[PDB]
Design goal:
lantibiotic, globular, little secondary structure, antibiotic
């Protein structure tokens, strides 16, 4: 994550979810 925002459609990496 960017911390753990991460993984359910908001900020998983930079490209896959919304980031």
């Amino acid at each position: 994550x960017s911390g753990w925002v991460c993984x359910l459609x908001i900020e998983c990496g930079x490209v896959i979810c919304a980031c």
